[PDB]
């Protein structure tokens, strides 16, 4: 039976951990206890707010319906209701107390209709769509004029203000994303904007919706540009423009990044809040891509391993990414260090992620990994996107594991801490307080091991004698987070606790 060295010090390396990490698009059991909430995708491209119509383009058909009312719960009623689709959306946010992300449009057209599949020669324009524009330039209607060709954005943005107020309000809208995988529209939207999007294409249809959402509501965070994954923050997907507008920049992140700095300045506004990818690993194990299936036990295994590519310099997956690009990872301090260099101030957000093993203790595991990681290295929002659906059993352990481990809706603090461990490969392990508190400390720690317990020997460094401890935690056998065997017996705040393999555990410890 091996030992672990675990060492936590709750004076060190004190950092904020934005609750936003905790977020979704898809809402999972509705216990999870999220604090975000995005309305993104696929779908939201060629969304038309005034008729609740969306487009599933290459998903689905290029089927123009109404997915989006069926999916938000709506009666064919409230369906006919201008924004009917994202006020109902920010309703349940409201209720649940979380922020909410919404998609706004720029590939250029919106559906017109609900009538099904969009041949290719109906391409927009046609009768199937209705042209985008950013600024009406004329007065707003709360009821929209549904029978012209038009959609207007700004006048979306100021139906939601009236209805909530602004973004700095309790009630507001928070957040709008400029569109979705803009890299990806001539893949998955080809009936839509068929052409791959040029680098200053993106600019400046970035740069007109922002400016136009901000003169209604200037407190509003701007997401952008929603990258797919690596290809786009590289070259945005092979832009035909690239090479000729690239410069010195290191990649297209670079490039967008400073320029939507540069039009900031010349329009004496910030014009971008958040610069916002998704991130789904292209990590292999057992030949299967961690994201495309459960796997084998070398898929798990990898499974397991892969949040290691978001922080660990030591760490190279089975990947195209860790292949050829070995320089841009660990990606999280990679894309820190390019957010702070080209755009100093603005925020970072993984706005679509999944490890995949959704009702496996891997994609358990690798999800209890990375919400600490998330939280300890600077990212303001993250939200996992459902890869399979139905339930996504170790998924939502995973975050009750944070955020309800007890079904009081109890949570991991708000204050990431020191916590180290000798074992990087077996273990990993996350500590938080809130409030600077020397009363009571969190550590969510884990075994990624199949075969091996490990015993855990923590040393803690803190103001207070800890006395005591309770645990909560899921395994293999369940996926609903059980109380385990409390911690009784702390001497000289150093404790042993053993961990079987394939588990996670929430400890909380108390000074009395
Ligand atoms: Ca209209
Ligand atoms: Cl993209």
């Not at 409201?94 to 041949?119: C, H």
């Not at 392990?429 to 923590?458: G, I, P, Y």
Request: proline fraction near 4%; hydrophobic fraction near 35%; glycine fraction near 8%.
């Amino acid at each position: 039976a091996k030992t672990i060295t675990i060492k936590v010090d709750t004076f060190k390396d004190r950092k904020p951990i934005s609750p936003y990490i905790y977020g979704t698009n898809q809402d999972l059991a509705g216990d999870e206890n999220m604090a975000a909430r995005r309305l993104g995708g696929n779908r939201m491209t060629g969304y038309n707010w005034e008729n609740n119509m969306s487009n599933a383009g290459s998903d689905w058909q290029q089927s123009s319906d109404n997915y989006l009312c069926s999916n938000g719960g709506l009666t064919q009623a409230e369906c006919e209701k201008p924004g009917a689709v994202t006020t109902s959306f920010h309703d349940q946010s409201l209720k649940l107390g979380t922020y909410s992300l919404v998609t706004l449009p720029m590939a250029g057209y919106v559906a017109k209709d609900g009538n099904g599949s969009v041949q290719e020669s109906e391409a927009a324009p046609s009768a199937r769509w209705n042209q985008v524009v950013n600024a009406k330039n004329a007065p707003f209607q709360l009821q929209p004029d549904l029978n012209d060709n038009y959609v207007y954005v700004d006048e979306f943005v100021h139906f939601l203000v009236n209805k909530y107020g602004t973004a700095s309000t309790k009630a507001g809208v928070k957040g709008y994303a400029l569109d979705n995988e803009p890299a990806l529209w001539s893949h998955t939207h080809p009936r839509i904007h068929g052409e791959k999007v040029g680098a200053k294409e993106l600019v400046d249809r970035s740069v007109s919706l922002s400016k136009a959402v901000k003169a209604i509501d200037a407190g509003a965070e701007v997401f952008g540009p929603v990258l797919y994954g690596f290809g786009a923050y590289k070259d945005l997907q092979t832009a035909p423009d690239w090479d000729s507008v690239k410069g010195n920049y290191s990649w297209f992140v670079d490039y967008y990044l400073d320029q939507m700095r540069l039009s900031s300045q010349v329009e004496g506004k910030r014009l971008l809040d958040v610069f916002d990818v998704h991130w789904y690993p292209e990590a292999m194990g057992g030949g299967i891509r961690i994201t495309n299936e459960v796997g084998n036990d070398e898929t798990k295994k990898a499974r397991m391993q892969a949040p290691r590519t978001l922080w660990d310099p030591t760490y190279k997956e089975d990947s195209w990414i860790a292949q050829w690009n070995s320089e841009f990872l660990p990606i999280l301090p990679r894309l820190k260090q390019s957010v702070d260099k080209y755009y100093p101030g603005t925020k970072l957000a993984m706005t679509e992620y999944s490890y995949g093993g959704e009702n496996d203790i891997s994609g358990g595991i690798a999800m209890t990994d990375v919400l600490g990681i998330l939280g300890k290295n600077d990212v303001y929002m993250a939200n996992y996107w459902k890869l399979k659906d139905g339930v996504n059993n170790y998924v939502s352990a995973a975050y009750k594991l944070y955020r309800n481990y007890d079904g009081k809706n109890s949570t991991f603090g708000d204050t990431s801490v020191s916590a180290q461990t000798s074992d990087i490969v077996n273990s990993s392990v996350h500590a938080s307080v809130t409030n600077a508190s020397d009363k009571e400390l969190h550590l969510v720690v884990m075994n990624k091991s199949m075969d091996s317990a490990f015993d855990a020997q923590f040393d803690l460094s803190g103001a207070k004698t800890y006395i005591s401890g309770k645990v909560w935690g899921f395994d293999k056998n369940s996926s609903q987070i059980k109380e385990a065997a409390p911690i009784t017996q702390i001497s000289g705040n150093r404790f042993t606790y053993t961990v079987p393999p394939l588990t996670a555990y929430h400890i909380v410890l108390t000074t009395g």
